[PDB]
């Protein structure tokens, strides 16, 4: 979280938290209810989001869903949307934690090696995530949509 990150840096330098570290915990916790609302809205529309991302993806890359494509077929496509459902879930976790610790251990560290083995094209997974940003972001107020958007762009960043 913001808490975990602050503390780990504190303990590693053998010291109490800084004024800065204390301030960010305070600003973070003040945004608690708002962050929880952002996760709720997105949890509430998960099935819609995953799907509109999936349409946006297959237009932009009809090949992935083509003879020599990693997601070619009905059940190679079913697993692909399931992976898109996984990452949206992790994005809700990140938003309520206020950093990526959880998102990272669960779904980016090791992701290159996993997908290389499965021969999944990584950059088109990054596209599926942009597609989810676009849908999710259209169900949130301007301010909340930006706050959510940072976590989408992080995942897009880590698959790189």
């Amino acid at each position: 979280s913001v808490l975990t990150k602050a503390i780990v840096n504190a303990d590693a330098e053998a010291r109490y938290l800084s004024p800065g570290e204390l301030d960010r915990i305070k600003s973070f916790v003040a945004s608690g209810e708002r962050r929880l609302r952002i996760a709720q809205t997105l949890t509430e529309a998960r099935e819609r989001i995953v799907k509109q991302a999936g349409d946006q993806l297959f237009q932009i890359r009809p090949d992935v869903v083509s003879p020599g494509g990693n997601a070619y077929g009905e059940k190679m496509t079913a697993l692909c949307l399931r992976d898109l459902d996984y990452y949206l879930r992790l994005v809700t976790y990140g938003i309520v934690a206020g950093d990526v610790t959880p998102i990272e251990e669960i779904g980016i560290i090791g992701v290159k090696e996993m997908y290389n083995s499965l021969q999944t094209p990584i950059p088109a997974v990054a596209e599926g995530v942009r597609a989810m940003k676009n849908v999710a972001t259209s169900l949130l107020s301007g301010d909340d949509a930006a706050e959510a958007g940072f976590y989408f762009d992080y995942l897009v960043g880590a698959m790189q």
Binding site: F150, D153, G157
Partner: protein, 161 residues
């Protein structure tokens, strides 16, 4: 390193002065542009790889540089070159967030000119790789942030030449 804010604090500390009106005006001039710097960094970070690819395509590859006898010939050296490109992009993004070029001197430019002379790395070609990434960046980040991102790419490139 230093940023806008610590640049001012250290300039006053050496005089042992409390911050006065002139100082406070400078810091405001930074804070007032702060939100825009953040948005711009999120665009650059999330388009990092595409910026390098479009910058290389306009300014490096399809050329003698990538052919036998060229410095970015061999997968080894091609990899080293776009690795470098990522450094530049990433650090320029730091400089622009900080609103201070001091990090570009401390962690990027110091000794780099001679390092490139010693390996044979073509300086002029590297500058074009920097000014092509700037061109791409300025499109992606928009009116708000274009001028502010641009200057630290220009800092980098006159640091080599």
């Amino acid at each position: 390193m230093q940023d806008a804010i610590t640049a001012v604090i250290n300039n006053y500390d050496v005089q042992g002065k409390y911050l006065d009106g002139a100082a406070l005006d400078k810091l405001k001039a930074y804070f007032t542009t702060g939100a825009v710097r953040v948005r711009a960094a999120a665009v650059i970070s999330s388009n990092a790889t595409t910026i390098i690819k479009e910058a290389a395509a306009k300014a490096l590859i399809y050329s003698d540089l990538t052919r036998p006898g060229g410095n970015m010939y061999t997968t080894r050296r091609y990899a080293a070159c776009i690795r470098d490109m990522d450094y530049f992009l990433r650090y320029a993004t730091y400089a622009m967030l900080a609103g201070d070029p001091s990090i570009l001197d401390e962690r990027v430019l110091n000794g780099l000119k001679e390092t490139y002379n010693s390996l044979g790395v073509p300086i002029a070609a590297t500058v074009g790789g920097i000014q092509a990434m700037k061109e791409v960046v300025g499109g992606l980040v928009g009116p708000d942030a274009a001028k502010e991102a641009s200057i630290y790419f220009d800092y980098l490139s006159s640091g080599l030449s």
